[PDB]
From TrEMBL:
InterPro entries, alphabetized: DUF1889 (IPR015079), YoaC-like_sf (IPR037210)
Protein name, per record: Cytoplasmic protein
Superkingdom of the source species: Bacteria
One Pfam assignment: DUF1889
Length: 100
């Protein structure tokens, strides 16, 4: 599913870092905002669950979960360099959502 693939992308980032790198932040936020706009939100709990499972840096999980919370709040979110969330990733997620 789109949500599972989204979590995979995030899992392929530098999950070990306490403070996510700029590319990772921009890309993680992009993924979250995009899926939420598509009607398939990624809840902060599905994020935390994933973070605990794969054993990411808990501080990293906290950040990704906090971004998913801002997205889920319905408010706008600042994404510094949005281009890092590639067209490949976007079209892949769009494809998975539509096939459901």
């Amino acid at each position: 599913t789109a949500i599972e693939k989204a979590l995979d992308f995030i899992g392929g980032m530098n999950t070990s870092a306490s403070v996510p790198h700029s590319m990772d932040e921009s890309t993680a936020k992009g993924i979250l905002k995009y899926l939420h706009d598509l009607g398939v939100p990624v809840s902060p709990e599905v994020v935390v669950a994933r973070g605990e499972q794969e054993g990411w840096n808990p501080e990293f999980t906290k950040k990704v979960a906090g971004w998913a919370e801002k997205v889920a709040s319905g408010n706008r979110i600042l994404i510094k360099n949005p281009e890092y969330f590639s067209t490949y990733m976007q079209e892949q997620l769009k494809e998975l959502v539509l096939e459901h």
